[PDB]
Design a protein around this ligand. Structure first.
Ligand SMILES: Nc1ncnc2c1ncn2[C@@H]1O[C@H](COP(=O)(O)OP(=O)(O)OP(=O)(O)O)[C@@H](O)[C@H]1O
Ligand SMILES: Nc1ncnc2c1ncn2[C@@H]1O[C@H](COP(=O)(O)OP(=O)(O)OP(=O)(O)O)[C@@H](O)[C@H]1O
Ligand SMILES: [Mg+2]
Ligand SMILES: [Mg+2]
Ligand SMILES: [Mg+2]
Ligand SMILES: [Mg+2]
Lengths: 339, 339
């Protein structure tokens, strides 16, 4: 046995089709004997739901497109008594309930759930992943894991924004984070956090190739963006450098009882930051260590860029990361553009 | 008119005293004509509540000690119709309600509220402050503000932890963040975020003196800690450096639609980080710019430490921040301790 709960959003749009997934889960879940409740209010869904067969149903539920923005808040494992024995799937429409003594519970539910969804926008992806897995993210114990650490950072951001109005800097930073986050997430990396004009993320050791392709993809999308936009647009001089390193880091909850953060700690972090900063003076936009090189299996053309200090380490790149430009020239071009 | 809502925790412990704040707010709120609802479930409180007189009541409510961990989720301003006209304060104990059709709404409420409180532990203090003020923190528009930027950072953290087990590094980092956060918050600064072994925070320009005292207090609490603990404890070699700068920075929501962060962007950020890093080579543990100096009104003994590069800027400190040690000696002492 096991119980699990999630909340959801509006994806599409009808008085009826509730009854579809009602009728269906009603007859479906009795062939498979699961019990649960569907509640709906002001365009939010809430659902409660053996141990194996309830996952054939969940794997259907997320891939179900009648709702988007699915977060499994809770999961209980090997339970003893079901919460809703006789209900194969009871659907409750709390917009239709106007009883005077249910409005309070109805209004709080509305208010705390909407607040909760605003807070999810500030959460580390690793905390949201924990939560979805039914793990309490505040009591996980920190573990030493192996990671490829990723750092990407805007070239001459001070100069590029030093003359822009507030809203235009924010638009530019957001676009940059938006393009980085999407490609990282598509290749199976997790963003760890944002630092100024800078994206920090990690990949596993089975994902080296995916870490170079991310890097290359990001470089590629910005070169497209720069000629997609007009020359008076700030996006026209948006460049990045990218640093990658490999190593054992600590992943866990860190901080006082007041504020918690869930992050990665280790020297690899520092090394990726510096290889990133080191691209500025390289004829390449991507720089990485030998450890990253050995996580790769594709026939990259690896170029050895010598040993550098942070005990100096070998640095490498791929031919595909050669810059079509000269990094000093780009930044005076950046200073000339806004006088 | 205005309505406001909050949630709360257990502070102390009785079947009766509900009726106290029941009876009291019942007669109290009718002298002042406010309407609202108190709900209680599994040790959580929820309350809904003219425009002026409801703040005499809130200012009582937080200072009321029967509950801790108060967060004002919502606030509506100049409303037209009250939600609960005839209820001066209706108290609803949802632990006593066993109706079969209320258990769902009861279980969800429980589940989403508990999740919500776990997420608050990951929120930036500035987002929580916005929320408490009734401002939607995801639509605030970014503003240029003036800030003293604070950076504090552990001396030789790599060396100090390079031989420790995972749990001991986390204990040490947590203690360090815990001591920093408490003193910063006591002096009216907000932590902005944690970066590795490093605390980032800000103060206003009216709070320079408070920024030096924080810095000095932190240095002081760690020197106490080091001789409070045994010499085999890692806390015995915990030191910090602190950098302060002043400047216009952008404060706002930054990122893609996936992840949002609420933070400060500007060159002052970079300058505080470097003055911090610069203490490592100084005979002082605190370093700051002229801009910080002019935010101070107390008769500090300001020591001019010359001009330094990051166009080189003047750097200053206070006599009270002189180190009783030599920064090279401390780190070999740190390497000798764990062989
Ligand atoms: N932890 C942080 N939080 C917020 N902003 C930061 C942080 N660290 C740096 N910044 C800011 O990010 C901006 C960019 O700094 P950065 O060091 O990337 O210089 P740059 O102008 O982009 O030159 P480069 O080509 O070396 O990147 C600066 O305004 C800096 O203060
Ligand atoms: N953005 C980050 N996120 C997580 N960890 C980080 C970050 N930046 C640095 N670190 C890690 O923090 C640790 C301390 O690095 P730091 O640069 O403070 O060196 P240190 O050993 O403390 O020497 P110093 O006396 O110069 O501080 C390193 O393991 C580093 O990789
Ligand atoms: Mg940059
Ligand atoms: Mg940067
Ligand atoms: Mg340090
Ligand atoms: Mg550091």
């Amino acid at each position: 046995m096991k119980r699990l709960v999630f909340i959801s959003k509006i994806s599409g749009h009808s008085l009826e089709e509730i009854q579809r997934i009602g009728k269906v889960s009603i007859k479906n879940n009795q062939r498979d004997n699961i019990t649960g409740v569907l509640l709906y209010l002001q365009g939010l869904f809430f659902q409660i739901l053996e141990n194996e067969k309830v996952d054939k149903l969940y794997k259907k539920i997320l891939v179900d497109d009648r709702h988007t923005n699915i977060l499994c808040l809770k999961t209980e494992y090997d339970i003893t008594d079901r919460m809703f024995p006789n209900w194969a799937m009871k659907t409750i429409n709390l917009n239709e309930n106007s009883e005077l003594m249910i409005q309070p519970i109805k209004s709080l539910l509305q208010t705390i759930t909407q607040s909760h969804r605003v807070l999810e926008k500030y959460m580390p992806a690793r905390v949201i992943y924990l939560i979805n897995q039914g793990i309490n993210p505040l009591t996980v114990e920190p573990q030493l894991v192996e990671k490829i650490i990723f750092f990407s950072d805007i070239l001459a951001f001070s100069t590029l924004t030093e003359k822009l109005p507030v809203n235009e800097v924010v638009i530019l930073v957001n676009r940059y984070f938006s393009i980085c986050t999407r490609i990282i997430s598509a290749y199976g990396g997790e963003v760890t956090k944002f630092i100024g004009d800078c994206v920090m993320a990690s990949f596993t050791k089975e994902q080296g190739d995916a870490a170079i392709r991310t890097s290359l993809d990001i470089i590629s999308e910005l070169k497209q963006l720069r000629h997609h936009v007009e020359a008076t647009n700030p996006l026209h001089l948006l460049y990045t450098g990218i640093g990658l390193s490999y190593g054992h880091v600590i992943e866990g909850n860190m901080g006082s009882s007041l504020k918690m953060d869930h992050t990665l700690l280790g020297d690899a972090v520092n090394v990726a930051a510096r290889l990133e900063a080191l691209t500025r003076q390289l004829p390449y936009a991507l720089a990485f260590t030998a450890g990253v090189k050995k996580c790769c299996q594709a026939q990259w053309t690896f170029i050895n860029l010598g040993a550098h200090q942070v005990e100096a380490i070998e640095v490498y790149t791929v031919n595909e990361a050669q810059k079509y430009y000269d990094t000093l020239q780009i930044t005076q071009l950046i200073r000339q553009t806004l006088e």
